[PDB]
């Protein structure tokens, strides 16, 4: 669709020139809908000094369906599973999700970055991590740091 293509050209331009701090996103090859992204570990989070790569797939009905985003870099987090799937409202269609066409790739990567700093034990994908985050925060932080040094550094 020409609508989809013109929208992706503008998004790639904005990702190339005014990416959110800590976030970068680019074409894997020459397809505007097969993208990769990277989020730096935030300071004063246990992911600090880690670099996290993500796969960003833009579905055929974008911008009416959300980007399909998974971590490629392993990450220890209540809302991210061992395959890198992300439990985050803006990645899902309504009524339950929050995706709308006025969000975009940069918005949702920023939301994923914010989720990394502020987990949601409301909506766990990882029950054991969520309980550890909630009830034994120092163990959570040590495990999350150790997973970062092991897989993201
Ligand atoms: N895989 C998965 N993603 C989710 C996003 C939500 F907002 C709620 C439940 C979810 O489950």
From Swiss-Prot:
It is an enzyme of class 2 (transferase). Changing residue 87 to A: Loss of E2 enzyme activity. Residues 3-153 form the UBC core domain. There is a cross-link at residue 92 (Glycyl lysine isopeptide (Lys-Gly) (interchain with G-Cter in ubiquitin)). Auto-ubiquitinated. In contrast, according to another report, autoubiquitination does not affect E2 enzyme activity. GO terms for cellular component: nucleolus; nucleoplasm; nucleus. It comes from the Eukaryota. Changing residue 3 to E: In FANCT; abolishes FANCD2 monoubiquitination; abolishes interaction with FANCL. Induction: Down-regulated following hypoxia. Up-regulated in breast cancers. The active site is at residue 87. GO terms for molecular function: ATP binding; chromatin binding; ubiquitin conjugating enzyme activity; ubiquitin protein ligase binding; ubiquitin-protein transferase activity. The keyword Transferase applies. Its EC number is 2.3.2.23. It catalyses: S-ubiquitinyl-[E1 ubiquitin-activating enzyme]-L-cysteine + [E2 ubiquitin-conjugating enzyme]-L-cysteine = [E1 ubiquitin-activating enzyme]-L-cysteine + S-ubiquitinyl-[E2 ubiquitin-conjugating enzyme]-L-cysteine. Transmembrane segments: none annotated. The keyword DNA repair applies. Keywords: ATP-binding, Disease variant, DNA damage, DNA repair, Fanconi anemia, Isopeptide bond, Nucleotide-binding, Nucleus, Phosphoprotein, Transferase, Ubl conjugation, Ubl conjugation pathway. Pathway: Protein modification; protein ubiquitination. It is found in: Nucleus. One of its GO terms (biological process) is protein K11-linked ubiquitination. Accepts ubiquitin from the E1 complex and catalyzes its covalent attachment to other proteins. Catalyzes monoubiquitination. Involved in mitomycin-C (MMC)-induced DNA repair. Acts as a specific E2 ubiquitin-conjugating enzyme for the Fanconi anemia complex by associating with E3 ubiquitin-protein ligase FANCL and catalyzing monoubiquitination of FANCD2, a key step in the DNA damage pathway. Also mediates monoubiquitination of FANCL and FANCI. May contribute to ubiquitination and degradation of BRCA1. Directly interacts with FANCL. Interacts with BRCA1. It is linked to Fanconi anemia complementation group T: A disorder affecting all bone marrow elements and resulting in anemia, leukopenia and thrombopenia. It is associated with cardiac, renal and limb malformations, dermal pigmentary changes, and a predisposition to the development of malignancies. At the cellular level it is associated with hypersensitivity to DNA-damaging agents, chromosomal instability (increased chromosome breakage) and defective DNA repair. Belongs to the ubiquitin-conjugating enzyme family. This is Ubiquitin-conjugating enzyme E2 T. It comes from Homo sapiens. The lineage of its organism: Eukaryota, Metazoa, Chordata, Craniata, Vertebrata. The gene is UBE2T.
């Amino acid at each position: 669709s020409m609508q989809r293509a013109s929208r992706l050209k503008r998004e790639l331009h904005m990702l190339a020139t005014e990416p959110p701090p800590g976030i970068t996103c680019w074409q894997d090859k020459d397809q505007m809908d097969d993208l990769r992204a990277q989020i730096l570990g935030g300071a004063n989070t246990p992911y600090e000094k880690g670099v996290f790569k993500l796969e960003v797939i833009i579905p055929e009905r974008y911008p009416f369906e959300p980007p399909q985003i998974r971590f490629l870099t392993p990450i220890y987090h209540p809302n991210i599973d061992s395959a890198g799937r992300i439990c985050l409202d803006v990645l899902k269609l309504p009524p339950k999700g929050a995706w709308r066409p006025s969000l975009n790739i940069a918005t949702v990567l920023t939301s994923i970055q914010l989720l990394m700093s502020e987990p949601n034990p409301d909506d766990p994908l990882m029950a054991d991590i969520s309980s550890e985050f909630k009830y034994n925060k120092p163990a959570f932080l040590k495990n999350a740091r150790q997973w970062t040094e092991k897989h993201a550094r």
